[PDB]
Write an enzyme that holds these catalytic residues in place. Structure first.
Site, mmCIF file in Angstrom:
data_model
loop_
_atom_site.group_PDB
_atom_site.id
_atom_site.type_symbol
_atom_site.label_atom_id
_atom_site.label_comp_id
_atom_site.label_asym_id
_atom_site.label_seq_id
_atom_site.Cartn_x
_atom_site.Cartn_y
_atom_site.Cartn_z
ATOM 1 N N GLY A 5 32.666 44.480 42.132
ATOM 2 C CA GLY A 5 33.678 44.132 41.157
ATOM 3 C C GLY A 5 33.134 43.315 40.007
ATOM 4 O O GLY A 5 33.524 42.157 39.828
ATOM 5 N N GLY B 83 31.970 45.299 36.853
ATOM 6 C CA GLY B 83 32.078 46.079 35.636
ATOM 7 C C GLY B 83 30.920 47.021 35.393
ATOM 8 O O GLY B 83 30.533 47.243 34.242
ATOM 9 N N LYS B 84 30.353 47.583 36.460
ATOM 10 C CA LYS B 84 29.270 48.546 36.297
ATOM 11 C C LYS B 84 29.808 49.941 36.024
ATOM 12 O O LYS B 84 29.370 50.607 35.080
ATOM 13 C CB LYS B 84 28.386 48.569 37.540
ATOM 14 C CG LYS B 84 27.692 47.264 37.843
ATOM 15 C CD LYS B 84 26.881 47.366 39.124
ATOM 16 C CE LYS B 84 27.732 47.345 40.384
ATOM 17 N NZ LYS B 84 28.745 46.261 40.438
ATOM 18 N N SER B 85 30.759 50.398 36.838
ATOM 19 C CA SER B 85 31.337 51.720 36.641
ATOM 20 C C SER B 85 32.181 51.761 35.375
ATOM 21 O O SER B 85 32.158 52.750 34.637
ATOM 22 C CB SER B 85 32.170 52.112 37.858
ATOM 23 O OG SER B 85 31.377 52.143 39.030
ATOM 24 N N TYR B 86 32.929 50.692 35.108
ATOM 25 C CA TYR B 86 33.694 50.617 33.870
ATOM 26 C C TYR B 86 32.771 50.651 32.663
ATOM 27 O O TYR B 86 33.105 51.231 31.625
ATOM 28 C CB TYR B 86 34.544 49.347 33.865
ATOM 29 C CG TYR B 86 35.407 49.169 32.639
ATOM 30 C CD1 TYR B 86 36.675 49.725 32.573
ATOM 31 C CD2 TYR B 86 34.960 48.431 31.553
ATOM 32 C CE1 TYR B 86 37.466 49.563 31.458
ATOM 33 C CE2 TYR B 86 35.745 48.263 30.435
ATOM 34 C CZ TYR B 86 36.998 48.831 30.392
ATOM 35 O OH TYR B 86 37.785 48.664 29.277
ATOM 36 N N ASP C 134 24.618 54.403 37.879
ATOM 37 C CA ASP C 134 25.624 53.425 38.277
ATOM 38 C C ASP C 134 25.432 53.134 39.758
ATOM 39 O O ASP C 134 25.640 54.013 40.601
ATOM 40 C CB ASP C 134 27.033 53.943 38.005
ATOM 41 C CG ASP C 134 28.100 52.895 38.254
ATOM 42 O OD1 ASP C 134 27.770 51.691 38.265
ATOM 43 O OD2 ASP C 134 29.273 53.279 38.446
ATOM 44 N N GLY D 22 27.470 47.415 44.809
ATOM 45 C CA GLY D 22 27.309 45.981 44.917
ATOM 46 C C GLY D 22 26.847 45.498 46.281
ATOM 47 O O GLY D 22 26.909 46.211 47.279
HETATM 48 N N1 ADP Z 1 35.675 44.615 30.066
HETATM 49 C C1 ADP Z 1 36.736 44.862 30.865
HETATM 50 N N2 ADP Z 1 37.993 44.908 30.377
HETATM 51 C C2 ADP Z 1 39.055 45.154 31.166
HETATM 52 N N3 ADP Z 1 38.951 45.371 32.490
HETATM 53 C C3 ADP Z 1 37.750 45.351 33.110
HETATM 54 C C4 ADP Z 1 36.548 45.091 32.312
HETATM 55 N N4 ADP Z 1 35.505 45.126 33.155
HETATM 56 C C5 ADP Z 1 35.993 45.389 34.393
HETATM 57 N N5 ADP Z 1 37.329 45.526 34.363
HETATM 58 C C6 ADP Z 1 38.177 45.811 35.544
HETATM 59 O O1 ADP Z 1 37.475 45.418 36.724
HETATM 60 C C7 ADP Z 1 37.319 46.520 37.617
HETATM 61 C C8 ADP Z 1 35.843 46.881 37.671
HETATM 62 O O2 ADP Z 1 35.507 47.562 38.874
HETATM 63 P P1 ADP Z 1 34.121 48.375 38.929
HETATM 64 O O3 ADP Z 1 33.354 48.064 37.670
HETATM 65 O O4 ADP Z 1 34.427 49.811 39.271
HETATM 66 O O5 ADP Z 1 33.333 47.690 40.147
HETATM 67 P P2 ADP Z 1 31.759 47.958 40.334
HETATM 68 O O6 ADP Z 1 31.159 47.507 39.028
HETATM 69 O O7 ADP Z 1 31.381 47.102 41.515
HETATM 70 O O8 ADP Z 1 31.672 49.441 40.590
HETATM 71 C C9 ADP Z 1 38.162 47.665 37.088
HETATM 72 O O9 ADP Z 1 39.375 47.787 37.838
HETATM 73 C C10 ADP Z 1 38.454 47.299 35.649
HETATM 74 O O10 ADP Z 1 39.809 47.604 35.312
HETATM 75 MG MG MG Z 2 31.314 51.409 40.902
#
Ligand code: ADP
Ligand code: MG
Ligand code: TA1
Ligand code: GTP
Ligand code: GDP
Ligand code: MG
Lengths: 441, 434, 367
Positions: free
Chosen positions: C97, C99-102, C250, C253
């Site tokens: 959690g 912001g890697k996939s996002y 990607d 974690g």
């Molecule tokens: N810059 C951002 N702006 C808005 N929401 C964000 C941002 N970065 C992350 N998020 C939120 O946080 C969560 C990120 O989860 P995710 O990146 O998939 O986890 P991981 O990086 O472990 O795969 C998402 O639900 C997303 O909506």
């Molecule tokens: Mg991910």
């Protein structure tokens, strides 16, 4: 009325437990079958001493203890040996596999599946008790069970029971001698989790008792049966005032206070001065002054650490047998006279005293002699920071290359738990420095 | 409860294991019928590690005999302890692997392997808690190298959280016994590195020196050699069957012997081995045993540890030993011979002590060592291999069974990377200031 | 002669639902280039410098880095070099959690780097589509899950369990690769988008305590771009070709089992992720020490991820790292591990080369 639960974790707790209940039976007159024959001509009394042994109406006495190893080899020697009719058949072995000397397995994989079963029998024993004073956990830094399963237990016991003394009698790793390549990790991850939950941890080191058995008892080829009997005496002296009479009695809640200045430096050491054979039992007087000084000789410490490289903060002296207070007061004045025994500025009264009348009992087949006096010293010193510093350096050598981590990571651990522990132990190493600085104004 | 499945692949393993049951039964009091005729009550307490109870306290071993030739299986049956094995556990075929790793892996072994899994899945499910497996094979041929490595590839997939120990006879440095030793030894290492946790490397040229230099034997047969390998196989699994003061399972050794997941190749040993005359002139004690165990002339791996550094070693003792006498002696090695050990492992030694010794010795010892001198064995095969593969000498017997040259190049570079993983550690290291 | 340095960048995420329910404190402050971490206990302060920093903490504060900004600052140079003839890699790293996939893939109305990359690539191709230059594009998208490889761009058949694993092999020249991998052709953005949808639907996701849509698998997006060009020669034209591999990665974690309440498959897959990150970490620690004179052996065979990415962490590629961090105080040591591995990745140097597809043949000796 006063009742203490002993917990023996691992192949080291048990073989100390077997060394303990061997002794707790002799002092109280119990046979290995749990029977007390002498009571028939007393018709009463309290020789069925409720501190350790619970009694059935049929004349049998069960000890208050749990024995846990996650391996059957050690406990099954009890079910088959001389002390099989004494214990409750609920000695806990789901030890279909061991922890492989892995804090992760004793804490995240195989510490589960038995921990809820372990809290159950303790919850059962405590409800049989009225005056639950505290616990006595026997374990060893260096294993997976004694390091992992103990941490997991001291957490869960700090919730179900809360504010009660949880005293650890732990085998601390020697600096040079060792029987595993993973003692530092298991010993550093243990302190990180036990520091916020325990109340006082008495350390021992086998490298020292090997030396004690050489000089004084003249045993040149000893083994663990000789080491563990010396430990049986340290615990007997501690829990003596809960069993017998005396001039000055010491509850369990007194070590928690005198010997813990701050909540993180609760790492004292143990000694037992009159360790002499039947040969040297003669030729000597064995006074309080002869014994008390022998507790301050660094060569007679049961932990390999020179207090002359550090300073004392709190010392507890537990006397047994034909002891008179005038003999004790004259002795501490002799120790406070010597300049090689340094005390901090903020603790001028650095001594605690306890006197009990029941002398120590001689186990048949042992190498210790019969004496009219016996003493146990419990000391908190700043010198043990040296041992932590060794252990943190070993950690650093073998963590910088991420050696052995995939065994821990492969059983439920994260890489970040290693860095958290090392910093906590660095703070404690720093905490042991602040308490050593004399204040200024 | 810590139950073990034994698997025996080839004319070597089935000749070693056949002695392994002549050595364990004498230790547990079992006769060649499976009947118990022992003396102590500790034998039957943990006999379930290797044996199963059949009908009338007759004890049937958990053995699996596999080969592509019926000749080896006839030796077991028409032998001393032939009548105890399960006759439905002898799996065999005909028209053996022909010294070809291609046949035991892909063509012939693949026809007979599912029959082997039928036995394994029945013996493992019948076990309460599986500690791991144990394979005795010879890499240098096609059955043990091919049909053994294939089984490990499959058991590791079905039982990935269990131990897979392996006792492998490696090619010897001086004299060959099969002309295509390199191709078969190479491809096996490409698979064992990925699918094993403990691999005990044995070499017959060293045993020829043990039997000659120590035991003073002038005509050592394979029975005598395998009478040494079976010993170490018993020492490793001693603290599961008998009690002691400091017990050690299989996992506790590997966790204390495998610092990185690929360096699980060990140099075993046994003590105390002596001639029938000098026995009356020796004193059995730990300083006399520790001198034999750490002697380079008591190894079975055909590699000198003095040309490297022990990353980590172990010692399994059996008898009424003194622990001060044990812990004092292991420390004497590191402090005396500190150059043959690594700096970033402070205590490079593990110890374990059982209380019930071997049938006729008041004390025995078993030694396991991981050193960088195993580099020399792999570095040799890589030289013989590329010398043949660069000209493509015998390659058409391996491609004609459904293989490619790329699978020969993968195993070369992997074994060469394992050399570099051991070679970085062998050179003395030094931090900035430390 | 070339020694291309790795382009490290950092992205601070805003507070999460968990870190707002538990009113966690802000500790990661920025000033532009530098990123500092004031511990709550206030005993020491750490600070790190990076090539690029992004602060998505506040949608209102100046310095807000958006998806388009991170793209135009990180990926666009990689696109320029990929057209030049280089291989390129962009890989994420961080905790659960964060912001890697996002950052890389994005959501439906908040695209990440991958769609923008493919879109601008096809735009530049359509704008440079002369008879002088032709362009051919293949894609693959695959998954690492419990040390097993899987193809994402297939429509699985119906069964009790339908995930056919693939094998990784080592070609003596091209290096590591995956045998049995769908390499699908692409002509424009629509096919890419459809394949991305299929892949993100087939990928492994689960609900854990720190993200309800936690990816349980490493994901690699490979684009093979072959551009053909002419030179007036003794005979026919169309005798130069330049190949380029773009690897967008990607990863998952660390996933502490205590916080991430996990038992069974989640523990199992989580443990696998922990063993994949430990290996990767060890490879980034040895590549940062091999660029300082000390000789070291990088362990790429202890994990399929690092084995396939042998050519990106080292070898022949222009590569970039996106570290992802959370500003809360309940994750300081994990954020610091991320930042330390990023500051060590800054020191990596690769040897990037133009894939003229002509070395040793004729024009090597012309040269
Ligand atoms: N810059 C951002 N702006 C808005 N929401 C964000 C941002 N970065 C992350 N998020 C939120 O946080 C969560 C990120 O989860 P995710 O990146 O998939 O986890 P991981 O990086 O472990 O795969 C998402 O639900 C997303 O909506
Ligand atoms: Mg991910
Ligand atoms: C003192 C005496 O009367 O003779 C000894 C003897 O000479 C020695 C040399 C024995 C002898 O061993 C050999 O002769 C031998 C021959 C070829 C290869 C290896 C050994 C002995 O046979 C071996 C035997 O020891 C055992 O039997 C162990 O229990 C051994 N048992 C078997 O292996 C075995 C084999 C077949 C059938 C039944 C048992 C063992 C070893 C390891 C683990 C468990 C058990 C003993 C004391 C002796 C003789 C009999 C001469 C030794 O045996 C071992 C390997 O422990 C060889 O070195 C030891 C030291 C013994 O003193
Ligand atoms: N005093 C004493 N110490 C022991 C004894 N047995 C083991 N130890 C010490 O314990 C350390 C190793 O840890 P173990 O006691 O084996 O811990 P464990 O409970 O067995 O954990 P596992 O190995 O996973 O089974 C060694 O360094 C020994 O010094 C014993 O009987 N008496
Ligand atoms: N130690 C030992 N090694 C053996 C024995 N028999 C064969 N070997 C080894 O095994 C190899 C022969 O391979 P093998 O499995 O018999 O070929 P296969 O019959 O086609 O399966 C040779 O390199 C020998 O060194 C034995 O009795 N003892
Ligand atoms: Mg144990």
């Amino acid at each position: 009325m006063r009742e203490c639960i002993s917990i023996h974790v691992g192949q080291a707790g048990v073989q100390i437990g077997n060394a303990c209940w061997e002794l707790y039976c002799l002092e109280h007159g119990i046979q290995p079958d749990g029977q007390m024959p002498s009571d028939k001509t007393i018709g009463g009394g309290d020789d069925s001493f409720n501190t350790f042994f619970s009694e059935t109406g049929a004349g049998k006495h069960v000890p208050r203890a749990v024995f846990v190893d996650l391996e059957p080899t050690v406990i099954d020697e009890v079910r088959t040996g001389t002390y099989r009719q004494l214990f409750h058949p609920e000695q806990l072995i789901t030890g279909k596999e061991d922890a492989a000397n892995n804090y992760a397995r004793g804490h995240y994989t195989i510490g589960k599946e038995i921990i809820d079963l372990v809290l159950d029998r303790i919850r059962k024993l405590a409800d049989q008790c009225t005056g639950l004073q505290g616990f006595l956990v026997f374990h060893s830094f260096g294993g997976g069970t004694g390091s992992g399963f103990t941490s997991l237990l001291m957490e869960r016991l700090s919730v179900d029971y809360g504010k009660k003394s949880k005293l650890e009698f732990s085998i601390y790793p020697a600096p040079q001698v060792s029987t595993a390549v993973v003692e530092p990790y298991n010993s550093i991850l243990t302190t990180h989790t036990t520091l916020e939950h325990s109340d006082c941890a008495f350390m021992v080191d086998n490298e020292a008792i090997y030396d004690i058995c050489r000089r004084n008892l003249d045993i040149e080829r000893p083994t663990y049966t000789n080491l563990n009997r010396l430990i049986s005496q340290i615990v007997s002296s501690i829990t003596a005032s809960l069993r017998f009479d005396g001039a000055l009695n010491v509850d369990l809640t007194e070590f928690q206070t005198n010997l813990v200045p701050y909540p993180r430096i609760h790492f004292p050491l143990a000694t037992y001065a009159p360790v002499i054979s039947a040969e040297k039992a003669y030729h000597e007087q064995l006074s309080v002054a002869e014994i008390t000084n022998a507790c301050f000789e660094p060569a007679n410490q049961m932990v390999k650490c020179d207090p002359r490289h550090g300073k004392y903060m709190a010392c507890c002296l537990l006397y047994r047998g034909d002891v008179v207070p005038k003999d004790v007061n004259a002795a501490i004045a002799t120790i406070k006279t010597k300049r090689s025994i340094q005390f901090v500025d903020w603790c001028p009264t650095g001594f605690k005293v306890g006197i009990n009348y029941q002398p120590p009992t001689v186990v048949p087949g042992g190498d210790l002699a019969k004496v009219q006096r016996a003493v146990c010293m419990l000391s908190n010193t700043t010198a043990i920071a040296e041992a932590w510093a060794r252990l943190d350096h070993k950690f650093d050598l073998m963590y910088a290359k991420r050696a052995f981590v995939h065994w821990y990571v492969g059983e439920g651990m994260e890489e970040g738990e290693f860095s958290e522990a090392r910093e906590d132990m660095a703070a404690l190493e720093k905490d042991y420095e602040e308490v050593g600085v004399d204040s200024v104004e | 409860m810590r139950e073990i499945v034994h698997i025996q692949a080839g004319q070597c393993g089935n000749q070693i294991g056949a002695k392994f049951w002549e050595v364990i039964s004498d230790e547990h009091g079992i006769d060649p019928t499976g009947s118990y005729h022992g003396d102590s009550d500790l034998q039957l307490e943990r006999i379930n590690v290797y044996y199963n109870e059949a009908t009338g306290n007759k004890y049937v071993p958990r053995a699996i005999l596999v080969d592509l030739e019926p000749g080896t299986m006839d030796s077991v049956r028409s032998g001393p302890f032939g009548q105890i094995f399960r006759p439905d556990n002898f799996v065999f075929g005909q028209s053996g692997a022909g010294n070809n790793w291609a046949k035991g892996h892909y063509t012939e072994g693949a026809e007979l392997v599912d029959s082997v899994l039928d036995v394994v899945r029945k013996e493992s499910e019948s076990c309460d808690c599986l500690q791991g497996f144990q394979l005795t094979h010879s890499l240098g041929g096609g059955t043990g190298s091919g049909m053994g490595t294939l089984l490990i590839s499959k058991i590791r997939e079905e039982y990935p959280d269990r131990i897979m120990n392996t006792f492998s006879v490696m090619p010897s440095p001086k004299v060959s016994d099969t002309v295509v030793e390199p191709y078969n030894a190479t491809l096996s290492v490409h698979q064992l590195v990925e699918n094993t946790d403990e691999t005990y490397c044995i070499d017959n040229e060293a045993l020829y020196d043990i039997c000659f230099r120590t035991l003073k034997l002038t005509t050592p047969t394979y029975g005598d050699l395998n009478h040494l390998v079976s010993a170490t196989m018993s020492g490793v699994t001693t603290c599961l069957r008998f009690p002691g003061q400091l017990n050690a399972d299989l996992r506790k050794l590997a966790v204390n012997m495998v610092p990185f997941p690929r360096l699980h190749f060990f140099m075993p040993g046994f003590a105390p081995l002596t001639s029938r005359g000098s026995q009356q002139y020796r004193a059995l004690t730990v300083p006399e045993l520790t001198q034999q165990m750490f002697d380079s002339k008591n190894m079975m791996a055909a590699c000198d540890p003095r040309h490297g550094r022990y990353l980590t070693v172990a010692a399994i003792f059996r008898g009424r030993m003194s622990m001060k006498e044990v812990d004092e002696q292991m420390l004497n090695v590191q402090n005396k011979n500190s150059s043959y050990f690594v700096e970033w492992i402070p205590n490079n030694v593990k110890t374990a002590v059982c209380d019930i010794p071997p049938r006729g010795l008041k004390m025995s010892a078993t030694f396991i060592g991981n050193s960088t001198a195993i580099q020399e064995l792999f570095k040799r095969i890589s030289e013989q291999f590329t010398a043949m593969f660069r000209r493509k000498a015998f390659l058409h017997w391996y491609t004609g069974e459904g293989m490619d040259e790329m699978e020969f190049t993968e195993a070369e570079s992997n074994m060469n990377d394992l050399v570099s993983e051991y070679q970085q550690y062998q050179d003395a290291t030094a931090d900035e200031q430390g | 002669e070339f020694n291309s340095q790795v382009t490290v960048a950092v992205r601070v995420r805003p507070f999460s639902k968990r870190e707002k329910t538990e009113k966690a404190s802000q500790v990661v402050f920025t000033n532009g280039e530098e990123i500092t971490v004031e511990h709550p206990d206030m005993k020491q302060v750490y600070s790190f410098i990076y090539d690029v920093s992004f602060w998505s903490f506040d949608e209102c504060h100046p310095g807000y880095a958006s998806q388009t900004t991170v793209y135009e600052t990180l990926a666009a140079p990689l696109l320029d070099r990929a057209f030049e003839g280089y291989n390129t890699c962009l890989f994420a790293y961080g905790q659960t959690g964060s912001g890697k996939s996002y950052t890389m893939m994005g959501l439906n109305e908040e695209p990440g780097i991958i769609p923008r990359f493919c879109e601008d690539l096809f735009a530049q191709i359509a704008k440079k589509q002369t008879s002088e230059v032709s362009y051919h594009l293949e894609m693959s998208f695959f998954e690492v899950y419990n040390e097993k490889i899987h193809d994402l761009l297939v429509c699985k058949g119906e069964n009790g369990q339908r995930k056919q694993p693939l094998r990784a092999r080592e070609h003596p020249v091209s290096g590591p690769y995956v045998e049995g991998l769908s390499m699908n052709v692409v002509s424009s953005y629509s096919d890419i988008q459809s394949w991305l949808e299929l892949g993100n639907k087939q990928r492994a996701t689960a609900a854990t305590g720190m993200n309800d849509k936690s990816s349980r698998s490493h994901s690699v997006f490979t684009l093979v771009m072959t551009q053909t060009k002419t030179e007036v020669v003794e005979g026919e034209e169309h005798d130069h070709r330049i190949t380029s591999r773009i690897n967008l990665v990607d990863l998952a974690g660390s996933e502490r089992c205590s916080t991430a309440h996990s038992s069974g498959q989640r523990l199992k897959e989580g443990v696998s992720i922990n063993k994949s990150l430990l290996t990767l970490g060890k490879v980034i620690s040895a590549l940062s020490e091999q660029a300082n004179g000390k000789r070291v052996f990088i362990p790429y065979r202890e994990s399929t991820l690092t084995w396939l990415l042998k050519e990106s962490l080292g070898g022949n590629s222009k590569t970039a790292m996106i570290a992802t961090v959370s500003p809360a105080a309940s994750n300081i040591e994990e954020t610091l591990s991320t930042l330390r591995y990023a500051t060590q990745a800054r020191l990596i140097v690769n040897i990037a080369k133009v894939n003229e597809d002509m070395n040793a043949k004729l024009i090597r000796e012309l040269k």
